Symmetry: D2
Subunit: 121 residues, 4 copies
């Protein structure tokens, strides 16, 4: 799956490129998008008091993002256990991967079947 | 008064602070204000009690820059049964470099400011 | 002009609605969009060391925004002086105005003619 | 150590802190770290000198909540000619509730860590 976004002015810092923690905000956004596009609009899940909180995140940065860049994230599910799973996220600007990472997230309890079935595409 | 420092991450490409952060800081001053009055706002949120904004205004005189030390002076200025206004003045280097206010109400569903809070505002 | 956005999970706070300062982030985003759509992609302007910094902003909030809401901002130029101008911004969710405000911004020097001409539509 | 408090605005609808904020706080710890070593980072940014991130990792053990008092313990752990790694440990209530690191380089155009900084890291 793909998640498009534009760098906003507010996403930048005084060094003139993106303030790096924003890369995790875009991963989180991509995560919600992923679940949604795959049939589970997370807004509902959130209202049920139910989530997929992070337990581990990582990101490696190859080239800077700038104000106004159009970018997208290729997201996929890499490991998938009973109560947890990993999402890999790839930042592509203009055909090129400019950063990449993952989030190990868990359910809150095990992952629901409708969810498992969905992940096995 | 609520003290704070400008983080690198509060700046943007233009070399100066992104503006809403001023609203973030007023929100923080507001919470720090109620807490020092004796009403720890973490306690209220837990009890699903809040003081939602209805209106907010800020007037920027001079720029904040990365690493600036700043404090906000908060006073309360329009207390009514169901709403109140906080005035916030940003002080840098002993001078006012921005000033705004927040109009806020009390909610749980809006409701009257609690009596204990009312008396604390009225002193 | 119109600027669409979705409330992200990160835009919300523990009270379960939008953290209000984000409304000014969306106004700023709308401001850049406005200038762009009207012929001046701000990314270039920024690289010239040239801006339209805020001197005053205000917003009034009628109804809460929630996670996943689709929203847009109707933006317009209300006053327009030699070295400054005002942008009014209206937050519409589902036909309804849920908040409204403005930004008084200035040039940095007077507003450029290409810009003035643009504002007189 | 770098002290900080969880602001209301650092939380999200789930009642707990939005995760990247942990990266924001590490970024702040990093800057506070270099400054206390004698290299005020505001001075470096002004001179267009930086220490850009190349990689960052965080491992979340327990939740931070609104109003939590927290501090980060920063140590330096992989110093090379052109890069270094900072380890950051979040301490709440005397316990480690998250821990990560940042791999960073020195830039101006990447370049070698300055000699004065090198010696300060090597002590």
């Amino acid at each position: 799956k793909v998640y498009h976004f534009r760098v906003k002015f507010g996403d930048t810092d005084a060094a003139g490129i993106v303030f790096y923690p924003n890369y995790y905000k875009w991963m989180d956004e991509a995560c919600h998008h992923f679940l949604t596009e795959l049939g589970f609009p997370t807004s509902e899940l959130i209202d049920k008091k139910i989530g997929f909180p992070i337990v581990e995140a990582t990101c490696q940065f190859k080239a800077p993002l700038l104000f106004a860049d159009h970018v997208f994230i290729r997201t996929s599910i890499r490991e998938l256990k009973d109560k947890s799973f990993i999402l890999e996220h790839h930042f592509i600007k203009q055909g090129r991967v400019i950063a990449s990472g993952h989030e190990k997230r868990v359910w809150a309890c095990p992952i629901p079947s409708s969810v498992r079935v969905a992940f096995a595409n």
